[PDB]
Amino acid sequence: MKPKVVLTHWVHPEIIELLSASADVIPNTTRETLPRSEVIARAKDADALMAFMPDSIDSAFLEECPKLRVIGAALKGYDNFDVNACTRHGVWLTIVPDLLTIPTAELTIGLLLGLTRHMLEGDRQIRSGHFQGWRPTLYGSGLTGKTLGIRGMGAVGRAIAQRLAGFEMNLLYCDRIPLNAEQEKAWHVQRVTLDELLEKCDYVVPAVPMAAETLHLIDATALAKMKTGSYLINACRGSVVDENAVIAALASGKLAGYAADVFEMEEWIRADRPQAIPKALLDNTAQTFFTPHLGSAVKEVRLEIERQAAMNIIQALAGEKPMGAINQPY
Amino acid sequence: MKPKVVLTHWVHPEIIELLSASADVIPNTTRETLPRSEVIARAKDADALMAFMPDSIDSAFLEECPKLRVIGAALKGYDNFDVNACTRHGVWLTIVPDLLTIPTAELTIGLLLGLTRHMLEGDRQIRSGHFQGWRPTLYGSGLTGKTLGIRGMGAVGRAIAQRLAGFEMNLLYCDRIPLNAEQEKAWHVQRVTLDELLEKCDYVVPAVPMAAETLHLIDATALAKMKTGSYLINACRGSVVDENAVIAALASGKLAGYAADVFEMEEWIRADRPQAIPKALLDNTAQTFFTPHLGSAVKEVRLEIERQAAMNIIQALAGEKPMGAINQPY
Ligand SMILES: NC(=O)c1ccc[n+]([C@H]2O[C@@H](COP(=O)(O)OP(=O)(O)OC[C@@H]3O[C@H](n4ccc(N)nc4=O)[C@H](O)[C@@H]3O)[C@@H](O)[C@H]2O)c1
C-alpha cells in the first residue's frame, strides 16, 4: 500500500524514520556508492528516489523506473539530472538550498593551518614514539602579517574572509564581479587582478566554480608568477588546479605546499582524467595536505541536507507542490 | 682572541652571521639535542652560551665552564636555570620577551579544526590510493552554533577568542580575573564559572599555566561534568590535563576527541614521571590529533627569539648590561 522510496546513499536513521510515516524505505545500509545497476534495480518499482551526487538521472534511468513520482536530490545543483526528462516523465525533481558554504569555509581554514604549520608530519612524528620534547624542527609560516588572496569572492570566498577577521592578515581578492563598499571593509578585503593577486600573495585560495571557461586557471603559467615559497589551498572543485603544474612547482621550490579537498580524478563529467591522485603528490607528505571531499562532512549539516530532500519527497508523495521543486510535471 | 659562543641547538644562518661579527660561534649544525656531556665539552671554554628548552643550567654545569660570562637564553622564562648560581659564578642570565602567543592561539585553532573534521584520517585514506570521489563518511563536528569554552583568559585565550570571532560560535570564558566591558563584546565571549563553562560546552580549551594550582585541572572530576561527545583541545602547557583521565573519558564516550600540542611527559620538574606519552593515546588515531610542541614553530617567531638571544649575548660580551638580564653578577 505504501509508496516505496529508494535511498541511494546512507542517511541518518532519523530521516528513515521520518520517511516511514508515509513510505516504505529501502535504504543503503553501507557507506558505499552502489553501482548504477543495483540502484536502477532497486528504484524500478519505487515511487520516490533520494539522489546523491554519484546518481546521474537521465532518460535511461527514468524509463527503467516508470513508477517514479519524485526525485528528491540531496544536492544544491542539478547538473547530473535531465530536468526536462523528469518533467516529460511526470517526475518532480527537487533540490536543497546551499548548506555547504560554512562547512567548506571552515575546512578551507583547516587546510591552511594544517599545511602551513606542518601538523600532519608533526602528528606522524608523535605516533613514531621518538618524541622527547621541543626541537627546532617543523618550522612553518604564520598567519598574522601575511597576505592571502581569495580568487573567487563567492559564497565560500565570503565566509572565509569573515572567518579570518581576527587573524590580523591582509586579504586580497580577484573576482570578475567586484563587491560593494560596506562588505569590502566589513571583512577588510581589497580587490585586485589575477596577475597581481597571484604575484603579491603568501597563500592563494581559489573559490571559483568549475566552468568550461576557468579550468586549470591555476596551471603552470599561473604558478610561475607567484611569490616563491607560497602556499596553494584548494577546496573548490578538482580540475581548477593543474595537479601536475604543482607536482613541478613543489619539487622546484616555487610554492611551499599544496592543500586540497578535491582532485581532478574526481570529475567524471570531464573527458580528460587520471583515475588516481598523482603518486608523487600522494608520496609528498612533507608539502601536501589532503581531505577526501570533506568540505561538507559535518554531521549537523548532512542531517539537514538529508532532512530537506526527505521533506521534498514527503510533500510530492502527498499531492503537495514540493518546496525544492524546480520543475512542473504534468 | 675572539670570544667563543656555543649555541646548544640549531639557529638560522642569519643569526650565526650576526654573532660572527663579535665572536667565534660553535653551532649545532643539526636539529637534535646534543647530550649534556657534549654541550659541556663545547662550552667548557666558551665565553657565551645560547640556551634552549632542553638545557638545564645548574652549579655543576657552570663549574665545568669557567670562562662563561653570559648565558643568553632563547626562552621567555627561566625555570631550568639556577639563577642565583649564575649570579654567584659571575655569569649574566638573559631571557627574551613572550612572542609565542599568536602562533600558539592559531595552532590551537588548527588543532580544533583538524580533530573535529577528521582531517588526519582523511589524509590517510587519500594516501591509501583507495579514494574514489565523494562518500558519506568522515562526518565530523562543525564550529558554527556550537559553544566553545576558554578556561582562563590570558594572552593566548584572548588571541584564540579574537580569532574565532567570525565563526558564529557561542564563546564562554572562565578566568578568576575579569575582562573589561567593550573587548568582551567585540569578541562575543561571556563570563561564566568553571562549573558553568564545563556544563554548557562542546569544545573545552584550557589556557592557564600549571603552577602548584591548576594541574590535572582537567581531571576525572572535571571530565565528569562536561558534555557527552565533547572535545578537549590542549595546546597550552602540558600536565594541566590529566592525560589518563582523558584516556578514560574517550573510552566512556564522554570525549569524542583529544588534540594536544603539549604533554605530561614534558616535565622533569615533577616527582611523577615515566618516559613517554601513554600509547593508548598514540594508537587512537581516530580520536586524537597531536603535534610535538609546535606552539611557536613559525619561522618569523623562532628567528626573532634567536636574534634577541643573539643580541643579549653580543651586548654582555661587549661589557654592556644586557637588555634581557634577569640578574646582576659581579
Ligand atoms: N569542497 C567543497 O565541498 C565545495 C563546497 C561548496 C561548493 N563547491 C563548489 O562550488 C564552488 C564554490 O564556490 P561558491 O562560493 O560556493 O560558488 P560561487 O558563489 O558561484 O563562486 C564564486 C564565483 O567565482 C566566479 N568566477 C570568477 C571569475 C571567473 N573567470 N569565473 C568565475 O566563474 C564568480 O565571481 C563567483 O563569485 C567551487 O568551490 C566548487 O568546488 C565545493
Automatic annotation (TrEMBL), chains A, B:
Record domain D-isomer specific 2-hydroxyacid dehydrogenase NAD-binding: where: 109-295
InterPro entries: D-isomer_2-hydroxyacid_DH, D-isomer_2_OHA_DH_cat_dom, D-isomer_DH_CS, D-isomer_DH_CS1, D-isomer_DH_NAD-bd, NAD(P)-bd_dom_sf
PROSITE patterns per record: D_2_HYDROXYACID_DH_1, D_2_HYDROXYACID_DH_3
An example molecular function term from Gene Ontology annotations: glyoxylate reductase (NADPH) activity
Domain D-isomer specific 2-hydroxyacid dehydrogenase catalytic, chain residue ranges per copy: 5-327
Matching Pfam families: 2-Hacid_dh (PF00389), 2-Hacid_dh_C (PF02826)
Keywords: Oxidoreductase
Coiled-coil intervals, chain numbering: none
Cellular component terms (Gene Ontology): cytosol
Family, as annotated: Belongs to the D-isomer specific 2-hydroxyacid dehydrogenase family.
PANTHER family: 2-HYDROXYACID DEHYDROGENASE-RELATED, GLYOXYLATE REDUCTASE 1
Protein name per UniProt: Phosphite dehydrogenase
Organism: Ralstonia sp. 4506
